[PDB]
Ligand binder design. Structure first.
Ligand SMILES: CCCCCCCCCCCCCCCCCC(=O)OC[C@H](COP(=O)([O-])OCC(O)COP(=O)([O-])OC[C@@H](COC(=O)CCCCCCCCCCCCCCCCC)OC(=O)CCCCCCCCCCCCCCCCC)OC(=O)CCCCCCCCCCCCCCCCC
Ligand SMILES: CCCCCCCCCCCCCCCCCC(=O)OC[C@H](COP(=O)([O-])OCC(O)COP(=O)([O-])OC[C@@H](COC(=O)CCCCCCCCCCCCCCCCC)OC(=O)CCCCCCCCCCCCCCCCC)OC(=O)CCCCCCCCCCCCCCCCC
Ligand code: 07D
Ligand SMILES: CCc1c(C)c2cc3nc(cc4[nH]c(c(CCC(=O)OC/C=C(\C)CC/C=C(\C)CC/C=C(\C)CCC=C(C)C)c4C)c4c5nc(cc1[nH]2)C(C)=C5C(=O)[C@@H]4C(=O)OC)C(C)=C3C(C)=O
Ligand SMILES: CCCCCC/C=C\CCCCCCCCCC(=O)O[C@H](COC(=O)CCCCCCCCCCCCCCC)COP(=O)(O)OC[C@@H](O)CO
Ligand SMILES: CCCCCCCCCCCCCCCC(=O)OC[C@H](COP(=O)(O)OCCN)OC(=O)CCCCCCCCCCCCCCC
Ligand SMILES: COC(C)(C)C\C=C/C(C)=C/C=C/C(C)=C/C=C/C(C)=C/C=C\C=C(C)\C=C\C=C(C)\C=C\C=C(C)\C=C\CC(C)(C)OC
Ligand SMILES: CCCCCCCCCCCCO[C@@H]1O[C@H](CO)[C@@H](O[C@H]2O[C@H](CO)[C@@H](O)[C@H](O)[C@H]2O)[C@H](O)[C@H]1O
Ligand SMILES: CCCCCCCCCCCCO[C@@H]1O[C@H](CO)[C@@H](O[C@H]2O[C@H](CO)[C@@H](O)[C@H](O)[C@H]2O)[C@H](O)[C@H]1O
Ligand SMILES: CCCCCCCCCCCCO[C@@H]1O[C@H](CO)[C@@H](O[C@H]2O[C@H](CO)[C@@H](O)[C@H](O)[C@H]2O)[C@H](O)[C@H]1O
Ligand SMILES: CCCCCCCCCCCCO[C@@H]1O[C@H](CO)[C@@H](O[C@H]2O[C@H](CO)[C@@H](O)[C@H](O)[C@H]2O)[C@H](O)[C@H]1O
Ligand SMILES: [Fe+3]
Lengths: 304, 256, 45, 47, 275, 47, 45, 47, 44, 44, 47, 45, 47, 47, 45
């Protein structure tokens, strides 16, 4: 009874990759092989492409990470021991309300603003990198727009809502426990963030993404004895694996997808999980002061 | 008050209803994409184009999108190429919901879990315009990685323990580096050679000796495995046929 | 199924309809005698 | 009117109609049960 | 009423229970014995939910709630008016979920495919059972299950989360959140890669597995593979559910205190316990 | 009406009908047990 | 479907639907007699 | 307008009309039930 | 198809006239019970 | 076989009667212990 | 202006237009129901 | 589609949209008589 | 009912009835244990 | 400026233009509704 | 697409858009008669 959960016998060949124009930068990384990764998936590692947008994104991101880490280490007076003790509790806090959207003093949130700007720039440059890498390989840019949804949520959390409130004071800090505490206090300040309906939609789409990527993973693993793992080939030439995958769900559920359209569902659930989340974040504080009172007004709560 | 639009209606509610409209449209779009294979629906008995469908029918089926291949080929989705109503089976009851009694050996008649899609007779292509599923003999560069049992020469047995045959060669996918098939020479017929999918094997590297076992079909069922033509490059239809035959074992491996 | 065996099954099916309905009617009569379930204008009791 | 069965199969029409009628009857009965005036089990006075 | 390829796999057999009695289809659905049983449990549970809505004061779909019995009843069966209806709906839901999974098993046997899908659904059934049976039994009362209501089960989630004064600090909860977020990210990447390979633009012949591997080799530095991605995705979702179950068993049955100050153990390891 | 068995197979429609009847009976009993007048186990007074 | 059975099926359907409608009408008449469901311009006095 | 059936199959139009009017009747009835005036089950006073 | 288009349209018109007539009778009865067009001073 | 159906029906109806008899005896014992039909004023 | 139907399938145009018009009508009706003045079911006074 | 059927469809469509717009304008006039929706300098009342 | 087992598998029927009867008896026993009067383990007073 | 349709498909461009104009009009209407001065449903005073 | 209808579309388009504007501007004029949307130095009213 085999399951295609682990690859008992592996194959290793001469590393090769799809052809790209040389460009200013070559492929970098001297590809190698790994055993556990080949047990769970492919064994080859790299090479990683590092173009102009890749260099720009890496430099901006590294600057942001170094600024954040330097501030975290400085907050505990440069003690490696006490840095270890408080690492989770350490955080680069955003500037206070009084400074508006302008530059705060470095100790009072200027470093947070500089780090956030550099991180935003690196994330956007990484988005451009995904777009350009997809276009270079003569492929579509679905990954870029799926990423753009996540960037929308990130910018709504960090920049857009501060713009609307005219204030970075309620932005999320750069810390492990501090950003969870920001989540908790954001929910408390605005009345039981469960009563945010776009939060409910985002949770529905997150649950649906997990559900869908368990359903689809189990379906492809169930038809992997029939060439079902080779999804694009079953999309261009429908084999019996795709037919049985469709008929299983048609018989158990009443309807079914295509090998191509199931990944459209997969794309859209993931994208909507963050799109509705960004909308719900942009709506709180600006339009809806208290989500519990909005729910009471609109029939979500028994009106105490 | 601050966020209202008309008395009871406010901005958050309006954006919510806008999302609901967008999600209804998105569900329609996704269902249109779903209805790109196997559509339109046929009658369960006669096979005429019929189904309990409303005003959404005009929007149910999308125009055929065109897939371009790196050979000049083209696929149309949906292509309204359907299966024949008359299959090698008979209705248990004439009620359009009843299942089918096979009218023969369903292993070799391609009925039920043995049924295979009527694909095209072309091997999968690599980036270089060559077959992807090839035996290791005609791919000198490819080799089996170490730290894994080499499945060459190991006895091929069923669940009952009878030695169905012996493995001589491995067939692998060039596009994705992994073993696809084991070439098995029959202990009962040297002049016969069969392909057994790698997904249907247990490694069995931890026992008294090393052997390859199959839990689906019995030893005698290896005498009727579908054959292939080129013996060094296998078409999509041939591989789909072989995989369907092997997958049919679990349902009726002991007669019908 | 044929047109004759359908009638043959319908006979025993009708017999079971009558038996089930009679038992249920007796049950409802007993419950009504115990506690009626149609309230009056002033309620119950 | 009898031409409706030249559009619709009678067996599936019967099963779907039976299901719809049963669900509707359950709904109306439950709605009446939740009603103060028409709950024949709780039986509050209408005066 | 059949797909272009459906009237070829509609063979009999593959049923665990019932023989040829329920081995048939109704419309697109396969029924089987376990389809009959899931109808039995679903109709009864939904009717009981609507009955509890009738007994309730709202009929507002989001304010309809079926509450479990008060904790003063312990693990005892409760009167139907006050607590028992929630218990019967719980049992009916468990029976319907099990019937659903078993019907999926029969469909898998009939189509000759692996049983991965019902096995994966077993984890969702286990999460529900841990929320309504296992955890309330360990805690000693049926009132620790969640109410069956749209917004009231969210009130339960919030109340139980703040019972430990910050439920984020539950480390198993952190790990489950990490797995859920990673599952969503991996699903986005996988759907995007498949769509981009299948729909590469004007001209732009359909790309092969090598192009898909090359994309993530260039962008990330590693590509899992068109088979291994479904593996890692199923494992990601199932592990997220497993760690959520673990974090809810840990809260109440095992740990009955503030999760935030559970982490003081970390603060006081001997190589930085400055005191 | 004897022809209904041409539209529905007795061997399976009978069992499905038995299941539906059991569900309905058990639901009605649960509803009665949920009430205050028709709960024969609580036996609350009508007066 | 074969038209040779539509004549019979429609007549059975008509008879049964009139029976069902009449039973429902008699039940509605009984409920209205017990308690009408259309309030006057004062409520349910 | 007798020509519209060249565009719309009578089965499709009939099924769609049945479903749409059932949903609309439910919606209007539920809106009436949520109103103080036209809820015929509680029968609240006009004045 | 025009083979049964005329007769289907005739039966459809008969059915839809029956539907509208009964719905209008229902609305008339409802209006006699309680009108749904408030006056300048609201409902009285 | 067909005779096996008759033998199963004989043994099954014997089991039906014995099972229902023991159930009725148990119900009669419980009723003597505590009747489950309350009176107009309840049990007490 | 009669040429637009050469661009669009009349079935597509008609069904889409009916859908859009019904959804818009529902939207407008609900917006009026939300107002204090144009809500004809509670009928708040003009004054 | 051919041009003749397009012209016929356009004629029927024009008549239908004329009837729809006329009935909608009639309804709007009745609503305006009931309660106009354009307020004045002081509002509505 | 001469030979009803020429239609129903005796093994499947026996197992299904055993499971159904066990589940129903367990449900009735738990319902009695939920009561105040028929809980033979708590043993409350009839008077 | 008639060569623009040699670059843009008239059907796709016309559909996109229609949808964009509808969303823009809807947004402008809701923006005016949000404002006090131009909300024609409450009808607040200019002063 | 061929130029033979590039003008055939355009002649309609450049007319239809005009008609659209001819309606929309009209609407705006009415709104300006009702409530102008350009405030003065002291604000609205
Ligand atoms: C909300 C926040 C966000 C959360 C995210 C999730 C939100 C939820 C929405 C997204 C998730 C669900 C997405 C699916 C929506 C669309 C489902 C769908 O189209 O299924 C059609 C599916 C049939 O597929 P089809 O190809 O459209 O068949 C129609 C044929 O024309 C004719 O079919 P036929 O004649 O073969 O059918 C006969 C059948 C009767 O068929 C039906 O009852 C279905 C009728 C509608 C189709 O027989 C009987 O069942 C009796 O039937 C179902 O809807 C099954 C129920 C599934 C929903 C429960
Ligand atoms: C009815 C009422 C409700 C409406 C419901 C609409 C359902 C959505 C329809 C849909 O999902 O179509 C997917 C469809 C999938 O395209 P595909 O078949 O994979 O492309 C094949 C090409 O060979 C390869 O195409 P490609 O990869 O070269 O195409 C790239 C293309 C987009 O193509 C993609 O990469 C995949 C789709 C990305 C999302 C596009 C849908 C956005 C929402 C609907 C609009 O890039 C864009 O046009 C930008 C789209 C995303 C802009 C998002 C900016 C923020 C907007 C919201 C604030 O993508 C689009 O329809 C693009 C729409 C562009 C206009 C967006 C206006 C906003
Ligand atoms: C007490 C807390 C309170 C409580 C009531 C509660 C409970 C629950 N919630 Mg919630 N939540 C509350 C608050 C709250 N909640 C959210 C969000 C969500 C979404 C996130 C989706 C996602 O993927 O995010 C995650 C995605 C992001 C943030 C966007 C993409 C991120 C990117 C590209 C970052 C790129 C990073 C690098 C390149 C690395 C280098 C950088 C550095 C080192 C610095 C999701 C659906 C979700 C789930 C649940 C569940 C299941 C529950 C249960 C069971 O109770 N919550 C966010 C949101 O969208 O809200 C609308 C948000 O902002 C916010 C707030 C304030
Ligand atoms: C559908 C919604 C879905 C949700 C649930 C979701 C959530 C979260 N997604 C998260 C993180 C990331 N997401 C990503 C990438 C961006 C990388 C970046 O910005 O680099 C740009 C930054 C930086 C350069 C800064 C640091 C740099 C470091 C640590 C290295 C420093 C050292 C250096 C340079 C020197 C040494 C090395 C040399 C070579 C010299 C990261 C890993 C991406 C995508 N999400 C998508 C979607 C989703 N993301 C899609 C479709 C994606 C992409 O396409 C893209 C990608 O590359 O995916 C592989 C997080 C933390 C999430 C949570 C839960 O909070
Ligand atoms: C399922 C998962 C859903 C997650 C998100 C749920 C969001 C609902 C929050 C909410 O409640 O949004 C409200 C309703 O939206 C609505 O129904 C819009 C209609 C809801 C359709 C739900 C479709 C699910 C598929 C806002 O509309 P209102 O005019 O105030 O309605 C008031 C009445 O309905 C109740 O008195
Ligand atoms: C990139 C780097 C620059 C990013 C910022 C760009 C300018 C933002 C507005 C500046 C401002 O003027 O926003 C200030 C005001 C708040 O002002 P206040 O009343 O608090 O003033 C207190 C004293 N200053 O925001 C608003 O209310 C309006 C918000 C408009 C929408 C915000 C979201 C915009 C996202 C970026 C879109 C970019 C698209 C570009 C075109 C392709
Ligand atoms: C490589 O590193 C070595 C040295 C080992 C170690 C270095 C660093 C370490 C250890 C770093 C550790 C970092 C940690 C723990 C980070 C935790 C980060 C988390 C959890 C962040 C989570 C959320 C934060 C978000 C979403 C913040 C978003 C902020 C944004 C988008 C702000 C944008 C602000 C802008 C654009 C400001 C504009 C204003 C001005 C005018 C200033 O712009 C010019
Ligand atoms: C100003 C505030 C801070 C924000 C940062 C602004 C500068 C960084 C973003 C600038 C815009 C980048 O936009 C992108 O630039 C790079 C060159 O740099 C170009 O891309 C270039 O590098 C790519 C890397 O894959 C190579 O294929 C090739 O050498 C060339 O195409 C893209 O054609 C352009 O789309
Ligand atoms: C299997 C299907 C079974 C179907 C069973 C259907 C039963 C339907 C019963 C309909 C007739 C009931 O009619 C109802 O009778 C009871 C008698 O207790 C009357 O009740 C009246 O009399 C009783 C007894 O004196 C007093 O409480 C009081 O005077 C008043 O309530 C109701 O005013 C009447 O409306
Ligand atoms: C499947 C069967 C479906 C049957 C559906 C039946 C629908 C019609 C039922 C109600 C018909 C109208 O019934 C009629 O309503 C008017 C209100 O205008 C009421 O009028 C009567 O009672 C009210 C007070 O309740 C008095 O103010 C009024 O003077 C008196 O005439 C009565 O209740 C009844 O005479
Ligand atoms: C085609 C669709 C799009 C149409 C777009 C139309 C845009 C142009 C509309 C406004 C044009 C300017 O309109 C002009 O504004 C100035 C502003 O001082 C007005 O000037 C006057 O009006 C204001 C209004 O409160 C008075 O307080 C004050 O006495 C004076 O300033 C003019 O009386 C008006 O004619
Ligand atoms: Fe996939």
């Amino acid at each position: 009874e085999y399951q295609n959960i682990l690859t008992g016998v592996q194959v290793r060949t001469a590393p090769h990759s799809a052809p790209i124009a040389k460009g200013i930068f070559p492929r970098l990384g001297k590809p190698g092989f790994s055993y556990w990764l080949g047990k769970i998936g492919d064994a080859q590692i790299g090479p990683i492409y590092l173009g102009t947008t890749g260099v720009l994104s890496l430099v901006f991101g590294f600057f942001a990470i170094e600024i954040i880490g330097f501030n975290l280490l400085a907050s505990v007076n440069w003690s490696p021991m006490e840095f270890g003790r408080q690492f989770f509790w350490l955080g680069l806090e955003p500037p206070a309300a009084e400074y508006g959207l302008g530059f705060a003093p470095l100790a009072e949130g200027g470093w947070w603003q500089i780090a956030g700007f550099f991180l935003t720039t690196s994330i956007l440059l990484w988005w451009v990198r995904m777009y350009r890498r997809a276009r270079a390989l003569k492929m579509g840019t679905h990954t870029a727009w799926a990423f753009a949804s996540a960037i929308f949520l990130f910018l709504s959390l960090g920049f857009i809502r501060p713009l609307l409130m005219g204030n970075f004071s309620e932005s999320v800090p750069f810390g492990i426990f501090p950003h969870l505490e920001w989540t908790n206090s954001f929910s408390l300040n605005y009345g039981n963030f469960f009563y945010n309906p776009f939060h409910m939609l985002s949770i529905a789409f997150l649950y649906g993404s997990a559900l869908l990527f368990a359903m689809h993973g189990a379906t492809i693993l169930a038809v992997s004895r029939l060439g079902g793992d080779r999804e694009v080939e079953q999309i261009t030439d429908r084999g019996t694996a795709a037919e049985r995958a469709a008929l299983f769900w048609r018989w158990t559920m009443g309807f079914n997808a295509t090998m191509e359209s199931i990944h459209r569902w997969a794309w859209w659930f993931a994208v909507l999980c963050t799109f509705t989340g960004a909308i719900g974040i942009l709506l709180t504080g600006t339009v809806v002061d208290n989500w519990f009172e909005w729910g009471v007004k609109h029939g979500l709560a028994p009106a105490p | 008050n601050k966020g209202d639009i008309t008395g009871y209606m406010d901005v958050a509610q309006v954006v919510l209803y806008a999302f609901w409209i967008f999600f209804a449209g998105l569900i329609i779009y996704l269902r249109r994409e779903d209805r790109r294979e196997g559509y339109p629906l046929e009658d369960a008995i006669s096979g005429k184009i019929n189904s309990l469908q409303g005003l959404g029918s005009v929007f149910s089926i999308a125009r055929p999108k065109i897939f371009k291949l790196k050979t000049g080929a083209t696929y149309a989705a949906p292509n309204f190429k359907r299966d024949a109503v008359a299959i090698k089976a008979t209705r248990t009851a004439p009620t359009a919901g009843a299942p089918f009694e096979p009218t023969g050996n369903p292993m070799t008649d391609a009925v039920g879990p043995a049924a295979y899609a009527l694909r095209d007779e072309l091997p999968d292509l690599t980036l270089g315009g060559q077959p992807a599923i090839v035996p290791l003999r005609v791919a000198p560069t490819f080799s089996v990685a170490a730290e894994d049992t080499d499945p060459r020469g190991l006895p091929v047995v069923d669940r009952k323990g009878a030695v169905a045959g012996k493995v001589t060669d491995l067939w692998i996918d060039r596009a994705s580096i992994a073993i696809r098939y084991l070439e098995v020479e029959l202990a009962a017929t040297p002049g016969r050679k069969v392909l057994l999918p790698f997904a249907a094997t247990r490694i069995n590297a931890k026992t008294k000796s090393k052997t390859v076992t199959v839990q689906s079909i019995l030893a005698r069922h290896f005498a009727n495995v579908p054959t292939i033509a080129k013996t060094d490059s296998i078409t999509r239809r041939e591989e789909d046929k072989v995989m369907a035959y092997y997958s049919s074992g679990y349902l009726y491996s002991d007669r019908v | 199924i044929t047109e004759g065996e359908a009638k043959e099954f319908h006979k025993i099916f009708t017999s079971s309809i009558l038996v089930f309905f009679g038992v249920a009617a007796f049950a409802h009569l007993l419950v009504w005698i115990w506690r009626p379930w149609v309230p009056g204008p002033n309620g119950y009791s | 009117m009898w031409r409706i069965w030249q559009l619709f199969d009678p067996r599936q029409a019967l099963v779907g109609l039976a299901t719809f009628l049963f669900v509707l009857a359950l709904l109306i009965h439950f709605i009446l049960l939740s009603t103060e005036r028409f709950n024949w089990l709780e039986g509050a006075s209408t005066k | 009423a059949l797909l272009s390829f459906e009237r070829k796999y509609r063979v009999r057999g593959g049923t665990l229970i019932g023989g040829d009695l329920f081995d048939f289809w109704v419309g697109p659905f396969y029924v089987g014995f376990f389809g009959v049983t899931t109808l039995l449990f679903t109709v009864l549970g939904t009717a009981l939910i609507v009955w509890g809505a009738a007994l309730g004061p709202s009929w507002t779909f989001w304010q309809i709630s079926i509450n479990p019995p008060d904790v003063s009843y312990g693990l005892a069966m409760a009167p139907m008016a006050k607590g028992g209806l929630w218990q019967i709906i719980t049992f009916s839901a468990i029976g319907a979920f099990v019937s659903w999974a078993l019907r999926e098993v029969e469909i898998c046997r009939k189509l000759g495919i692996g049983y991965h899908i019902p096995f994966a659904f077993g984890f969702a059934i286990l999460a529900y059972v841990s929320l309504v049976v296992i955890r309330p039994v360990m805690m000693g009362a049926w009132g620790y299950g969640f109410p069956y209501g749209f917004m009231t089960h969210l009130d339960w989630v919030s109340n139980t989360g703040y019972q430990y004064a910050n439920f984020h600090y539950n480390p198993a909860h952190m790990l489950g959140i990490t797995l859920f977020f990673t599952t969503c990210l991996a699903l986005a990447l996988h759907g995007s890669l498949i769509l981009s390979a299948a729909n590469p633009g004007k001209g732009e012949v359909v790309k092969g597995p090598e192009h898909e591997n090359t994309y993530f080799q260039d962008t990330i530095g590693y590509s899992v593979g068109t088979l291994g991605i479904h593996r890692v995705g199923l494992i990601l979702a199932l592990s997220a559910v497993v760690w959520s179950i673990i974090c809810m068993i840990l809260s109440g049955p095992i740990y009955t205190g503030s999760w935030p100050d559970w982490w003081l153990w970390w603060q006081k390891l001997p190589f930085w316990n400055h005191g």
